[PDB]
UniProtKB/Swiss-Prot annotation, chain B:
Natural source organism: Homo sapiens
Source species, domain of life: Eukaryota
SMART domains: PINT
Protein name: 26S proteasome non-ATPase regulatory subunit 6
Record PANTHER family: 26S PROTEASOME NON-ATPASE REGULATORY SUBUNIT 6 (PTHR14145:SF1), 26S PROTESOME SUBUNIT 6 (PTHR14145)
Swiss-Prot record, chain C:
Quaternary structure annotation from Swiss-Prot or TrEMBL: Component of the 19S proteasome regulatory particle complex. The 26S proteasome consists of a 20S core particle (CP) and two 19S regulatory subunits (RP). The regulatory particle is made of a lid composed of 9 subunits including PSMD11, a base containing 6 ATPases and few additional components.
Induction remark: By FOXO4; expression in embryonic stem cells (ESCs) is mediated by FOXO4.
Protein name: 26S proteasome non-ATPase regulatory subunit 11
Encoding gene, per UniProt annotation: PSMD11
Species name: Homo sapiens (Human)
Domain of life: Eukaryota
Function: Component of the 26S proteasome, a multiprotein complex involved in the ATP-dependent degradation of ubiquitinated proteins. This complex plays a key role in the maintenance of protein homeostasis by removing misfolded or damaged proteins, which could impair cellular functions, and by removing proteins whose functions are no longer required. Therefore, the proteasome participates in numerous cellular processes, including cell cycle progression, apoptosis, or DNA damage repair. In the complex, PSMD11 is required for proteasome assembly.
Membership in a protein family: Belongs to the proteasome subunit S9 family.
Localization terms from the record: Nucleus; Cytoplasm, Cytosol
Length: 40, 378, 54
């Protein structure tokens, strides 16, 4: 009963949520926020 | 029998973050590979770090020491097969065989795990095995064996009660938790810092204090926060050793703006140098941030970000994208503004936001049983 | 090392002659219950001795 069209056609798996904030963003985070002391 | 090659597993973590260098590898690589018959700490590092010029007078004298250790195994278990006692072979050879697992690979499985697991009923030898799957889940940085030792230890958690070592089970289950983003049970099970005084799987007990305070500074609400990290009696001395740790707590509880980031730079330096914590260096830092902004932003309602940037350091555009990501990330509900510049806060979830999760579960899980309800006829 | 010698010998005032100093230093590091225990040791010490020093 299982098929009918379709036979023709802890890890980081939970860390993926904030890793979506880690991959597109904030990879040099305290390399700029840590340099807010002396940049200005 | 645990802590030297566990420290060499910390040297594997020293191989982890400084990658560009091949000299700080080889120096204490040779220092850890000339001491105390350790074939595997240069064998896997032969598989990872620099290879060998030769090994004949260098380390085949230590495979010759391994040969000597092996021929006295062939002395010992053939001298213990005559004796008929407390499984003399498996006991007096699980000693040298956990030492063999210190020498070489996971053949310590067959010659330790079941070699003492098929005889005993006491949890001491099996718990040495659990601690050795812990140390080899520190060698290989396992996800497997540091769960398999829990799978083996819960076979004797079901009857127990013991003073130090079961609290150490709590400690390493918490290290398994906060080896990934699992955070509160680690601190809750570390919180009984008294009975964990010194056993020969510990590192510096003071560093155990630093690790429990790093994990207990968050997942601990402000009354519990002040009662534990402030009103803690015996904790105060073992954080009076390190000034910057007590400075970190009093700078966080002080709730300033720039000593937030000075303190946070100290714990930025500290958080990396930490094995099975340094690949988790990011959500802890913005977790400190989200706790700080959450305790600082509910109280005001006529708030300007000029009042922030006057005392954070610089935030005129520097905290702009920071707080914007923090708000639109799902949490830290306030409103960031155009140059009208009034930051507007929200409710304590006493009335409004509470009214969702009931139908959020009566949809999902009750809809799974709607499917099973529609399993009647066909 | 002071606990290695005095609690076996007889001079019970000479015990608290340093145990009370330890009750000071557990306030100096703010170890509150152990300083309470040291004060209790002082109180259960001083009822055997008349007053030969102050």
């Amino acid at each position: 009963m299982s098929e009918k069209k379709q036979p023709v056609d802890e890890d980081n798996w939970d860390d993926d949520n904030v890793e979506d904030d880690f991959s597109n963003q904030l990879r040099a985070e305290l390399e700029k926020h840590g340099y807010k002391m002396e940049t200005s | 029998p645990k802590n030297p090659d566990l420290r060499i597993a910390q040297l594997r973590f020293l191989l982890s973050l400084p990658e560009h260098r091949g000299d700080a590898a080889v120096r204490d690589e040779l220092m850890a590979a000339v001491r105390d018959n350790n074939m595997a700490p240069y064998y896997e590092a032969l598989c990872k770090s620099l290879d060998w010029q030769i090994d004949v007078d260098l380390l085949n004298k230590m495979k010759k020491a391994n040969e000597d250790e092996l021929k006295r195994l062939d002395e010992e278990l053939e001298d213990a097969e005559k004796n008929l006692g407390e499984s003399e072979i498996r006991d007096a050879m699980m000693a040298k065989a956990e030492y063999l697992c210190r020498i070489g690979d996971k053949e310590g499985a067959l010659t330790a795990f079941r070699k003492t697991y098929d005889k005993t009923v006491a949890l001491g030898h099996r718990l040495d095995i659990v601690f050795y799957l812990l140390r080899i889940g520190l060698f290989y940085m396992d996800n497997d064996l540091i769960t398999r030792n829990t799978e083996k230890a819960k076979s004797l958690i079901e009857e127990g009660g013991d003073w130090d070592r079961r609290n150490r089970l709590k400690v390493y289950q918490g290290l398994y938790c906060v080896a990934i983003r699992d955070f509160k049970q680690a601190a809750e099970l570390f919180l009984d810092t008294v009975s964990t005084f010194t056993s020969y799987e510990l590192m510096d007990y003071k560093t155990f204090v630093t690790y429990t305070v790093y994990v207990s500074m968050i997942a601990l609400e402000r009354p519990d926060l002040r009662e534990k990290v402030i009103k803690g009696a015996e904790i105060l001395e073992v954080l009076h050793s390190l000034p910057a740790v007590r400075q970190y707590l009093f700078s966080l509880y002080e709730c300033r703006y720039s000593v937030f980031f000075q303190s946070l730079a100290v714990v930025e330096q500290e958080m990396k140098k930490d094995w099975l914590f340094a690949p988790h260096y990011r959500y802890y830092v913005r977790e400190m941030r989200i706790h700080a902004y959450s305790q600082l932003l509910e109280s005001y309602r006529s708030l300007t970000l000029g009042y922030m940037a006057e005392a954070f350091g610089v935030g005129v555009e520097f905290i702009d994208q920071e707080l914007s990501r923090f708000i639109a990330a799902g949490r830290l509900h306030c409103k960031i503004d155009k140059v009208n510049e009034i930051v507007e806060t929200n409710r304590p979830d006493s009335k409004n936001w509470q009214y969702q999760e009931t139908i959020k579960k009566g949809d999902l899980l009750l809809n799974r049983v709607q499917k099973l309800s529609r399993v009647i006829n066909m | 090392q002071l606990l290695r010698e005095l609690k076996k010998m007889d001079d019970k005032a000479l015990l608290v002659e340093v145990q009370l100093l330890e009750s000071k230093t557990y306030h100096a590091l703010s170890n509150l219950p152990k300083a309470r225990a040291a004060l209790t040791s002082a109180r259960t010490t001083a009822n055997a001795i008349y007053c030969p020093p102050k």
